[PDB]
GROMACS .gro file of N, CA and C in nm:
model
  405
    1UNK      N    1   0.075  -0.115   0.008
    1UNK     CA    2   0.002   0.002   0.010
    1UNK      C    3   0.101   0.113  -0.005
    2UNK      N    4   0.043   0.247  -0.049
    2UNK     CA    5   0.119   0.365  -0.024
    2UNK      C    6   0.038   0.488  -0.013
    3UNK      N    7   0.077   0.589   0.048
    3UNK     CA    8   0.018   0.711   0.077
    3UNK      C    9   0.049   0.810  -0.030
    4UNK      N   10  -0.059   0.876  -0.065
    4UNK     CA   11  -0.078   0.993  -0.146
    4UNK      C   12  -0.124   1.117  -0.094
    5UNK      N   13  -0.084   1.235  -0.134
    5UNK     CA   14  -0.132   1.363  -0.072
    5UNK      C   15  -0.263   1.403  -0.137
    6UNK      N   16  -0.339   1.467  -0.043
    6UNK     CA   17  -0.468   1.516  -0.074
    6UNK      C   18  -0.486   1.668   0.005
    7UNK      N   19  -0.578   1.728  -0.035
    7UNK     CA   20  -0.602   1.860   0.016
    7UNK      C   21  -0.734   1.850   0.073
    8UNK      N   22  -0.753   1.904   0.194
    8UNK     CA   23  -0.905   1.917   0.252
    8UNK      C   24  -0.979   2.015   0.177
    9UNK      N   25  -1.110   1.982   0.164
    9UNK     CA   26  -1.210   2.060   0.085
    9UNK      C   27  -1.303   2.083   0.196
   10UNK      N   28  -1.384   1.973   0.239
   10UNK     CA   29  -1.489   2.001   0.358
   10UNK      C   30  -1.504   1.868   0.442
   11UNK      N   31  -1.494   1.899   0.570
   11UNK     CA   32  -1.527   1.785   0.655
   11UNK      C   33  -1.685   1.750   0.660
   12UNK      N   34  -1.756   1.637   0.640
   12UNK     CA   35  -1.894   1.634   0.637
   12UNK      C   36  -1.953   1.547   0.734
   13UNK      N   37  -1.876   1.465   0.801
   13UNK     CA   38  -1.920   1.371   0.914
   13UNK      C   39  -1.811   1.308   0.986
   14UNK      N   40  -1.829   1.238   1.083
   14UNK     CA   41  -1.718   1.163   1.144
   14UNK      C   42  -1.665   1.063   1.055
   15UNK      N   43  -1.720   1.014   0.964
   15UNK     CA   44  -1.672   0.906   0.875
   15UNK      C   45  -1.642   0.927   0.729
   16UNK      N   46  -1.692   1.060   0.698
   16UNK     CA   47  -1.682   1.113   0.564
   16UNK      C   48  -1.620   1.248   0.554
   17UNK      N   49  -1.534   1.257   0.443
   17UNK     CA   50  -1.465   1.389   0.420
   17UNK      C   51  -1.454   1.403   0.289
   18UNK      N   52  -1.469   1.543   0.221
   18UNK     CA   53  -1.439   1.568   0.102
   18UNK      C   54  -1.300   1.629   0.063
   19UNK      N   55  -1.221   1.573  -0.006
   19UNK     CA   56  -1.085   1.593  -0.030
   19UNK      C   57  -1.065   1.635  -0.198
   20UNK      N   58  -0.968   1.707  -0.207
   20UNK     CA   59  -0.914   1.723  -0.355
   20UNK      C   60  -0.799   1.615  -0.381
   21UNK      N   61  -0.822   1.525  -0.478
   21UNK     CA   62  -0.746   1.426  -0.492
   21UNK      C   63  -0.687   1.424  -0.623
   22UNK      N   64  -0.568   1.416  -0.677
   22UNK     CA   65  -0.534   1.419  -0.800
   22UNK      C   66  -0.601   1.509  -0.892
   23UNK      N   67  -0.633   1.636  -0.844
   23UNK     CA   68  -0.672   1.736  -0.905
   23UNK      C   69  -0.834   1.749  -0.909
   24UNK      N   70  -0.896   1.641  -0.843
   24UNK     CA   71  -1.055   1.660  -0.854
   24UNK      C   72  -1.109   1.633  -0.710
   25UNK      N   73  -1.209   1.712  -0.693
   25UNK     CA   74  -1.291   1.693  -0.557
   25UNK      C   75  -1.344   1.559  -0.553
   26UNK      N   76  -1.335   1.490  -0.431
   26UNK     CA   77  -1.386   1.353  -0.417
   26UNK      C   78  -1.424   1.338  -0.270
   27UNK      N   79  -1.531   1.259  -0.245
   27UNK     CA   80  -1.592   1.225  -0.116
   27UNK      C   81  -1.529   1.087  -0.085
   28UNK      N   82  -1.451   1.104   0.042
   28UNK     CA   83  -1.402   0.975   0.094
   28UNK      C   84  -1.481   0.920   0.212
   29UNK      N   85  -1.501   0.795   0.216
   29UNK     CA   86  -1.547   0.734   0.335
   29UNK      C   87  -1.440   0.665   0.404
   30UNK      N   88  -1.428   0.683   0.546
   30UNK     CA   89  -1.296   0.618   0.607
   30UNK      C   90  -1.321   0.466   0.614
   31UNK      N   91  -1.232   0.383   0.550
   31UNK     CA   92  -1.227   0.233   0.575
   31UNK      C   93  -1.242   0.193   0.718
   32UNK      N   94  -1.313   0.070   0.735
   32UNK     CA   95  -1.318  -0.002   0.853
   32UNK      C   96  -1.377   0.050   0.981
   33UNK      N   97  -1.444   0.168   0.977
   33UNK     CA   98  -1.504   0.222   1.083
   33UNK      C   99  -1.640   0.281   1.065
   34UNK      N  100  -1.707   0.239   1.174
   34UNK     CA  101  -1.845   0.303   1.181
   34UNK      C  102  -1.862   0.415   1.284
   35UNK      N  103  -1.885   0.548   1.258
   35UNK     CA  104  -1.907   0.643   1.363
   35UNK      C  105  -2.053   0.654   1.385
   36UNK      N  106  -2.088   0.707   1.484
   36UNK     CA  107  -2.221   0.747   1.488
   36UNK      C  108  -2.263   0.878   1.404
   37UNK      N  109  -2.368   0.874   1.354
   37UNK     CA  110  -2.423   0.983   1.242
   37UNK      C  111  -2.476   1.101   1.299
   38UNK      N  112  -2.466   1.218   1.224
   38UNK     CA  113  -2.523   1.333   1.241
   38UNK      C  114  -2.637   1.349   1.114
   39UNK      N  115  -2.600   1.295   1.003
   39UNK     CA  116  -2.673   1.283   0.902
   39UNK      C  117  -2.694   1.132   0.859
   40UNK      N  118  -2.775   1.061   0.947
   40UNK     CA  119  -2.817   0.925   0.924
   40UNK      C  120  -2.930   0.905   0.843
   41UNK      N  121  -2.911   0.807   0.736
   41UNK     CA  122  -3.024   0.792   0.636
   41UNK      C  123  -3.160   0.775   0.717
   42UNK      N  124  -3.165   0.723   0.832
   42UNK     CA  125  -3.284   0.683   0.904
   42UNK      C  126  -3.300   0.760   1.028
   43UNK      N  127  -3.208   0.738   1.113
   43UNK     CA  128  -3.213   0.816   1.251
   43UNK      C  129  -3.237   0.962   1.253
   44UNK      N  130  -3.103   1.014   1.253
   44UNK     CA  131  -3.082   1.151   1.265
   44UNK      C  132  -2.944   1.190   1.298
   45UNK      N  133  -2.940   1.247   1.425
   45UNK     CA  134  -2.818   1.288   1.502
   45UNK      C  135  -2.799   1.193   1.615
   46UNK      N  136  -2.739   1.088   1.594
   46UNK     CA  137  -2.723   0.981   1.705
   46UNK      C  138  -2.632   1.017   1.799
   47UNK      N  139  -2.615   0.967   1.918
   47UNK     CA  140  -2.534   1.002   2.029
   47UNK      C  141  -2.393   0.967   2.001
   48UNK      N  142  -2.307   1.084   2.024
   48UNK     CA  143  -2.167   1.094   2.007
   48UNK      C  144  -2.139   1.096   1.866
   49UNK      N  145  -2.234   1.123   1.782
   49UNK     CA  146  -2.238   1.152   1.642
   49UNK      C  147  -2.160   1.304   1.621
   50UNK      N  148  -2.226   1.385   1.687
   50UNK     CA  149  -2.166   1.526   1.696
   50UNK      C  150  -2.025   1.513   1.750
   51UNK      N  151  -1.980   1.450   1.856
   51UNK     CA  152  -1.837   1.446   1.884
   51UNK      C  153  -1.748   1.379   1.790
   52UNK      N  154  -1.798   1.277   1.729
   52UNK     CA  155  -1.716   1.217   1.624
   52UNK      C  156  -1.680   1.288   1.502
   53UNK      N  157  -1.796   1.369   1.486
   53UNK     CA  158  -1.781   1.466   1.359
   53UNK      C  159  -1.695   1.585   1.390
   54UNK      N  160  -1.677   1.633   1.519
   54UNK     CA  161  -1.594   1.742   1.547
   54UNK      C  162  -1.455   1.698   1.566
   55UNK      N  163  -1.446   1.562   1.603
   55UNK     CA  164  -1.297   1.497   1.629
   55UNK      C  165  -1.252   1.487   1.483
   56UNK      N  166  -1.318   1.435   1.388
   56UNK     CA  167  -1.258   1.419   1.254
   56UNK      C  168  -1.205   1.543   1.178
   57UNK      N  169  -1.317   1.647   1.206
   57UNK     CA  170  -1.296   1.784   1.140
   57UNK      C  171  -1.178   1.852   1.197
   58UNK      N  172  -1.162   1.858   1.333
   58UNK     CA  173  -1.055   1.936   1.401
   58UNK      C  174  -0.919   1.854   1.360
   59UNK      N  175  -0.911   1.731   1.364
   59UNK     CA  176  -0.790   1.660   1.338
   59UNK      C  177  -0.745   1.683   1.190
   60UNK      N  178  -0.842   1.699   1.102
   60UNK     CA  179  -0.791   1.699   0.979
   60UNK      C  180  -0.775   1.856   0.926
   61UNK      N  181  -0.875   1.937   0.989
   61UNK     CA  182  -0.846   2.085   0.968
   61UNK      C  183  -0.721   2.146   1.013
   62UNK      N  184  -0.657   2.093   1.135
   62UNK     CA  185  -0.552   2.133   1.175
   62UNK      C  186  -0.411   2.073   1.141
   63UNK      N  187  -0.420   1.995   1.031
   63UNK     CA  188  -0.303   1.914   1.003
   63UNK      C  189  -0.235   1.999   0.891
   64UNK      N  190  -0.094   1.987   0.888
   64UNK     CA  191  -0.002   2.028   0.779
   64UNK      C  192  -0.010   1.949   0.668
   65UNK      N  193  -0.020   1.815   0.673
   65UNK     CA  194  -0.016   1.724   0.578
   65UNK      C  195  -0.122   1.610   0.575
   66UNK      N  196  -0.210   1.612   0.473
   66UNK     CA  197  -0.303   1.508   0.469
   66UNK      C  198  -0.277   1.395   0.365
   67UNK      N  199  -0.287   1.281   0.384
   67UNK     CA  200  -0.256   1.181   0.299
   67UNK      C  201  -0.369   1.054   0.275
   68UNK      N  202  -0.385   1.025   0.163
   68UNK     CA  203  -0.472   0.905   0.150
   68UNK      C  204  -0.400   0.780   0.124
   69UNK      N  205  -0.454   0.681   0.177
   69UNK     CA  206  -0.403   0.543   0.155
   69UNK      C  207  -0.510   0.451   0.126
   70UNK      N  208  -0.515   0.405   0.010
   70UNK     CA  209  -0.606   0.289  -0.049
   70UNK      C  210  -0.563   0.166   0.001
   71UNK      N  211  -0.661   0.073   0.015
   71UNK     CA  212  -0.626  -0.073   0.047
   71UNK      C  213  -0.617  -0.165  -0.064
   72UNK      N  214  -0.612  -0.293  -0.062
   72UNK     CA  215  -0.581  -0.366  -0.203
   72UNK      C  216  -0.710  -0.408  -0.289
   73UNK      N  217  -0.837  -0.387  -0.211
   73UNK     CA  218  -0.961  -0.423  -0.290
   73UNK      C  219  -0.998  -0.318  -0.366
   74UNK      N  220  -1.142  -0.307  -0.390
   74UNK     CA  221  -1.203  -0.194  -0.455
   74UNK      C  222  -1.174  -0.074  -0.385
   75UNK      N  223  -1.154   0.048  -0.458
   75UNK     CA  224  -1.126   0.176  -0.396
   75UNK      C  225  -1.248   0.267  -0.394
   76UNK      N  226  -1.360   0.231  -0.447
   76UNK     CA  227  -1.476   0.316  -0.440
   76UNK      C  228  -1.592   0.233  -0.403
   77UNK      N  229  -1.686   0.302  -0.327
   77UNK     CA  230  -1.810   0.218  -0.296
   77UNK      C  231  -1.926   0.242  -0.398
   78UNK      N  232  -2.043   0.189  -0.383
   78UNK     CA  233  -2.151   0.207  -0.479
   78UNK      C  234  -2.199   0.351  -0.470
   79UNK      N  235  -2.155   0.426  -0.385
   79UNK     CA  236  -2.207   0.573  -0.386
   79UNK      C  237  -2.106   0.669  -0.453
   80UNK      N  238  -2.003   0.612  -0.508
   80UNK     CA  239  -1.891   0.691  -0.566
   80UNK      C  240  -1.799   0.730  -0.468
   81UNK      N  241  -1.808   0.703  -0.341
   81UNK     CA  242  -1.714   0.742  -0.248
   81UNK      C  243  -1.575   0.679  -0.250
   82UNK      N  244  -1.461   0.753  -0.231
   82UNK     CA  245  -1.337   0.678  -0.216
   82UNK      C  246  -1.325   0.592  -0.085
   83UNK      N  247  -1.252   0.472  -0.077
   83UNK     CA  248  -1.247   0.404   0.040
   83UNK      C  249  -1.106   0.402   0.085
   84UNK      N  250  -1.076   0.457   0.188
   84UNK     CA  251  -0.929   0.481   0.226
   84UNK      C  252  -0.901   0.506   0.373
   85UNK      N  253  -0.775   0.479   0.398
   85UNK     CA  254  -0.718   0.513   0.538
   85UNK      C  255  -0.675   0.670   0.512
   86UNK      N  256  -0.702   0.755   0.604
   86UNK     CA  257  -0.679   0.890   0.581
   86UNK      C  258  -0.579   0.938   0.702
   87UNK      N  259  -0.465   0.988   0.678
   87UNK     CA  260  -0.357   1.022   0.780
   87UNK      C  261  -0.349   1.172   0.775
   88UNK      N  262  -0.355   1.237   0.901
   88UNK     CA  263  -0.326   1.379   0.934
   88UNK      C  264  -0.190   1.385   1.002
   89UNK      N  265  -0.101   1.439   0.941
   89UNK     CA  266   0.043   1.444   0.987
   89UNK      C  267   0.103   1.316   1.041
   90UNK      N  268   0.058   1.214   0.954
   90UNK     CA  269   0.120   1.079   0.981
   90UNK      C  270   0.045   1.004   1.080
   91UNK      N  271  -0.074   1.056   1.124
   91UNK     CA  272  -0.151   0.980   1.228
   91UNK      C  273  -0.279   0.954   1.150
   92UNK      N  274  -0.309   0.813   1.161
   92UNK     CA  275  -0.448   0.753   1.088
   92UNK      C  276  -0.558   0.812   1.156
   93UNK      N  277  -0.646   0.887   1.081
   93UNK     CA  278  -0.768   0.926   1.142
   93UNK      C  279  -0.856   0.811   1.181
   94UNK      N  280  -0.845   0.702   1.112
   94UNK     CA  281  -0.954   0.585   1.126
   94UNK      C  282  -0.922   0.535   1.261
   95UNK      N  283  -0.800   0.524   1.298
   95UNK     CA  284  -0.742   0.454   1.427
   95UNK      C  285  -0.781   0.556   1.541
   96UNK      N  286  -0.739   0.675   1.519
   96UNK     CA  287  -0.752   0.785   1.628
   96UNK      C  288  -0.902   0.775   1.669
   97UNK      N  289  -1.008   0.767   1.578
   97UNK     CA  290  -1.148   0.758   1.623
   97UNK      C  291  -1.182   0.641   1.702
   98UNK      N  292  -1.139   0.528   1.661
   98UNK     CA  293  -1.155   0.395   1.736
   98UNK      C  294  -1.083   0.401   1.875
   99UNK      N  295  -0.950   0.456   1.875
   99UNK     CA  296  -0.878   0.455   2.003
   99UNK      C  297  -0.960   0.535   2.115
  100UNK      N  298  -1.026   0.643   2.056
  100UNK     CA  299  -1.102   0.733   2.143
  100UNK      C  300  -1.239   0.692   2.164
  101UNK      N  301  -1.281   0.578   2.136
  101UNK     CA  302  -1.422   0.527   2.166
  101UNK      C  303  -1.506   0.609   2.077
  102UNK      N  304  -1.472   0.664   1.956
  102UNK     CA  305  -1.564   0.751   1.894
  102UNK      C  306  -1.603   0.686   1.767
  103UNK      N  307  -1.563   0.561   1.747
  103UNK     CA  308  -1.607   0.475   1.638
  103UNK      C  309  -1.583   0.326   1.663
  104UNK      N  310  -1.664   0.253   1.598
  104UNK     CA  311  -1.656   0.099   1.611
  104UNK      C  312  -1.590   0.039   1.488
  105UNK      N  313  -1.516  -0.072   1.497
  105UNK     CA  314  -1.458  -0.139   1.385
  105UNK      C  315  -1.584  -0.191   1.314
  106UNK      N  316  -1.592  -0.154   1.155
  106UNK     CA  317  -1.716  -0.196   1.099
  106UNK      C  318  -1.712  -0.354   1.047
  107UNK      N  319  -1.828  -0.394   0.981
  107UNK     CA  320  -1.815  -0.518   0.907
  107UNK      C  321  -1.707  -0.526   0.808
  108UNK      N  322  -1.624  -0.626   0.808
  108UNK     CA  323  -1.507  -0.626   0.719
  108UNK      C  324  -1.530  -0.708   0.590
  109UNK      N  325  -1.470  -0.654   0.491
  109UNK     CA  326  -1.476  -0.722   0.364
  109UNK      C  327  -1.363  -0.741   0.290
  110UNK      N  328  -1.302  -0.873   0.293
  110UNK     CA  329  -1.179  -0.890   0.225
  110UNK      C  330  -1.183  -0.855   0.072
  111UNK      N  331  -1.078  -0.803   0.019
  111UNK     CA  332  -0.956  -0.783   0.077
  111UNK      C  333  -0.920  -0.656   0.127
  112UNK      N  334  -1.023  -0.579   0.164
  112UNK     CA  335  -1.000  -0.444   0.213
  112UNK      C  336  -1.001  -0.449   0.365
  113UNK      N  337  -0.893  -0.508   0.408
  113UNK     CA  338  -0.887  -0.529   0.563
  113UNK      C  339  -0.744  -0.526   0.612
  114UNK      N  340  -0.652  -0.462   0.528
  114UNK     CA  341  -0.513  -0.471   0.576
  114UNK      C  342  -0.504  -0.400   0.721
  115UNK      N  343  -0.563  -0.315   0.766
  115UNK     CA  344  -0.526  -0.257   0.898
  115UNK      C  345  -0.636  -0.311   1.002
  116UNK      N  346  -0.687  -0.423   0.966
  116UNK     CA  347  -0.796  -0.474   1.056
  116UNK      C  348  -0.758  -0.500   1.204
  117UNK      N  349  -0.641  -0.574   1.210
  117UNK     CA  350  -0.599  -0.621   1.354
  117UNK      C  351  -0.562  -0.490   1.440
  118UNK      N  352  -0.479  -0.413   1.382
  118UNK     CA  353  -0.442  -0.289   1.446
  118UNK      C  354  -0.552  -0.201   1.485
  119UNK      N  355  -0.654  -0.181   1.407
  119UNK     CA  356  -0.768  -0.100   1.448
  119UNK      C  357  -0.856  -0.218   1.564
  120UNK      N  358  -0.852  -0.345   1.554
  120UNK     CA  359  -0.924  -0.419   1.647
  120UNK      C  360  -0.853  -0.406   1.789
  121UNK      N  361  -0.721  -0.383   1.789
  121UNK     CA  362  -0.653  -0.374   1.906
  121UNK      C  363  -0.685  -0.237   1.980
  122UNK      N  364  -0.697  -0.132   1.888
  122UNK     CA  365  -0.721  -0.011   1.949
  122UNK      C  366  -0.870  -0.001   2.006
  123UNK      N  367  -0.960  -0.078   1.924
  123UNK     CA  368  -1.085  -0.068   1.988
  123UNK      C  369  -1.099  -0.163   2.133
  124UNK      N  370  -1.016  -0.259   2.135
  124UNK     CA  371  -1.022  -0.338   2.258
  124UNK      C  372  -0.961  -0.253   2.368
  125UNK      N  373  -0.869  -0.161   2.360
  125UNK     CA  374  -0.831  -0.077   2.457
  125UNK      C  375  -0.923   0.047   2.482
  126UNK      N  376  -0.986   0.106   2.375
  126UNK     CA  377  -1.088   0.201   2.412
  126UNK      C  378  -1.199   0.138   2.501
  127UNK      N  379  -1.234  -0.003   2.472
  127UNK     CA  380  -1.332  -0.057   2.548
  127UNK      C  381  -1.314  -0.073   2.714
  128UNK      N  382  -1.190  -0.141   2.704
  128UNK     CA  383  -1.124  -0.158   2.842
  128UNK      C  384  -1.111  -0.033   2.920
  129UNK      N  385  -1.096   0.082   2.852
  129UNK     CA  386  -1.095   0.219   2.919
  129UNK      C  387  -1.225   0.268   2.920
  130UNK      N  388  -1.337   0.213   2.876
  130UNK     CA  389  -1.469   0.275   2.876
  130UNK      C  390  -1.486   0.416   2.837
  131UNK      N  391  -1.410   0.434   2.710
  131UNK     CA  392  -1.432   0.572   2.652
  131UNK      C  393  -1.554   0.590   2.565
  132UNK      N  394  -1.624   0.706   2.583
  132UNK     CA  395  -1.721   0.746   2.491
  132UNK      C  396  -1.836   0.637   2.445
  133UNK      N  397  -1.828   0.597   2.342
  133UNK     CA  398  -1.920   0.490   2.299
  133UNK      C  399  -1.927   0.361   2.387
  134UNK      N  400  -1.815   0.340   2.475
  134UNK     CA  401  -1.809   0.233   2.542
  134UNK      C  402  -1.823   0.275   2.697
  135UNK      N  403  -1.870   0.390   2.733
  135UNK     CA  404  -1.910   0.419   2.870
  135UNK      C  405  -2.046   0.400   2.907
   0.00000   0.00000   0.00000
């Protein structure tokens, strides 16, 4: 796998961000994680949704360098969103959310699961620490 540079356009939700990638605006879905929603297809504004969304936003808005890392499977979902690991100054946003108990590890689909174990370890620690989602 390898990291490419992107530029923030707009943060949309805890799990979705708009980036400029290779010259074009693109919506990215964060791989392997489910955050609570502020714009949920059915519910609405779920609990910890606003805090997951401010965390993604702050972490990416305050970065010097954003990079996108695709996995080895398909790179877009059926809504045309890019599927990627996102890095703010070298720190994976997907893992930061899970480590903080602001996201769960999602239902996984091979072969888009390279960082699955790593994230699952972070979720286990957030759980043991009773953070946010887990309190």
